[PDB]
């Protein structure tokens, strides 16, 4: 797909169009775009004006790259992301992650809306991603497939420690300072292709494999991020309890859930920003 140079050119283009030099990158999922307000000294670029960038076609994804200061911390946010079901191969879905590494970003925060498989989860819950299950990877659909680019990372990167332990600990401390009634959930995220929603037999199956939440994104990004050395932290906004007995999922409802949790996710991410090291 892309050559090392391609990533370089896009990085140089961003560096020369804004004075902002982000240390952290945040990828906002479906209905999580609101995080971009409260960003101060913001600078926005539409994905379409940035050389080599893909386009967001899904409802709820603005398709804008936003630079700014969040809580005394310089960062860059993807208001909208890319999904495999849209038609993009993983090397396109993850293009932004390598660009961020080339800008000097050290930490990546991934976020998404997902279905809750763990029966103890409630709509509106926030689940820290402690680990993931990459179903597409089982069959070979992987962003690292093909010749390896030594300049980014190694041929066989390990994924067992993908989700930084210290940041997860910090997220737990930050949450207690918020005095929330609900406790911070934590679990395994499983990714499948989409775009259709799962059947009851599929959900039972996912749950029995040890999954706590299901979605159609994020995993490709974490993989590429770990491959090029970025520290990674992530969470799912539980948008609905999945049906396990023989209603029905719809995107509008997931977006609605995102609006309702806006105040909560915004303060949570703001506070969290003051806890990133380096
Ligand atoms: N039952 C269920 N609830 C969900 N909430 C979000 N997603 C992730 C899929 N996200 C799509 C449509 O919301 C847009 O990226 C899901 C899902 O796959 N299943
Ligand atoms: Mg400015
Ligand atoms: Zn210009």
Curated annotation (Swiss-Prot):
A matching Pfam family: PNP_UDP_1
Highest taxon, organism lineage: Eukaryota
Reactions accelerated catalytically: inosine + phosphate = alpha-D-ribose 1-phosphate + hypoxanthine; guanosine + phosphate = alpha-D-ribose 1-phosphate + guanine; 2'-deoxyguanosine + phosphate = 2-deoxy-alpha-D-ribose 1-phosphate + guanine; 2'-deoxyinosine + phosphate = 2-deoxy-alpha-D-ribose 1-phosphate + hypoxanthine
Protein's UniProt keywords contain Transferase: yes
Binding residues annotated for phosphate, in chain numbering: 30, 61, 81-83, 113, 217
GO biological process, one term: purine ribonucleoside salvage
Keyword flag Zinc-finger: no
Pathway: Purine metabolism; purine nucleoside salvage
Main location: cytoplasm
Keyword terms of this UniProt record: Acetylation, Cytoplasm, Glycosyltransferase, Phosphoprotein, Purine salvage, Transferase
Gene3D superfamilies: Nucleoside phosphorylase domain (3.40.50.1580)
GO-annotated molecular function: guanosine phosphorylase activity; purine-nucleoside phosphorylase activity
Entries under PROSITE patterns matching the protein: PNP_MTAP_2 (PS01240)
Annotated positions for site Important for substrate specificity: 240
EC number(s) per entry: 2.4.2.1
One GO cellular component, as annotated: cytoplasm
Subcellular location: Cytoplasm
Biological function: Catalyzes the phosphorolytic breakdown of the N-glycosidic bond in the beta-(deoxy)ribonucleoside molecules, with the formation of the corresponding free purine bases and pentose-1-phosphate. Preferentially acts on 6-oxopurine nucleosides including inosine and guanosine.
Family (UniProt): Belongs to the PNP/MTAP phosphorylase family.
Subunit structure and binding partners: Homotrimer.
Name this protein carries in UniProt: Purine nucleoside phosphorylase
Organism: Bos taurus (Bovine)
Lineage start: Eukaryota, Metazoa, Chordata, Craniata, Vertebrata
């Amino acid at each position: 797909g892309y050559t090392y140079e391609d990533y370089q050119d896009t990085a140089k283009w961003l560096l020369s169009h804004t004075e902002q030099r982000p240390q952290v990158a945040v990828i906002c999922g479906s209905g999580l775009g609101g995080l971009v307000n409260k960003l101060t000294q913001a600078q926005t670029f539409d994905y379409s004006e940035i050389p080599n960038f893909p386009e967001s076609t899904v409802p709820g994804h603005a398709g804008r790259l936003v630079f700014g200061i969040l809580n005394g911390r310089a960062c860059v946010m993807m208001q909208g992301r890319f999904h495999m079901y849209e038609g993009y191969p993983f090397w396109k879905v993850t293009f932004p992650v390598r660009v961020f590494r080339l800008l000097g970003v050290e930490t990546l925060v991934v976020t998404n809306a997902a279905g809750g498989l763990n029966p103890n989860f409630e709509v509106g819950d926030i689940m820290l991603i402690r680990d993931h299950i990459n179903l597409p990877g089982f069959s070979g659909q992987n962003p690292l497939r093909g010749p390896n680019e030594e300049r980014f990372g190694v041929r066989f990167p390990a994924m067992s420690d993908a989700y930084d332990r210290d940041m997860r600990q910090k997220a737990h401390s930050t949450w207690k300072q918020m005095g929330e009634q609900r406790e911070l959930q934590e679990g395994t995220y499983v990714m499948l292709g989409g775009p259709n929603f799962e059947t009851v037999a599929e959900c039972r199956l996912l749950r029995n494999l040890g999954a706590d939440a299901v979605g159609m994104s994020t995993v490709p990004e974490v993989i590429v991020a770990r491959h090029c050395g970025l520290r990674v932290f992530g969470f799912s906004l539980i948008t609905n309890k999945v049906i396990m007995d023989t209603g029905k999922a719809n995107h509008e409802e997931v977006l609605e859930a995102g609006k309702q949790a806006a105040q909560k996710l915004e303060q949570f991410v703001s506070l969290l920003m003051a806890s990133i090291p380096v």
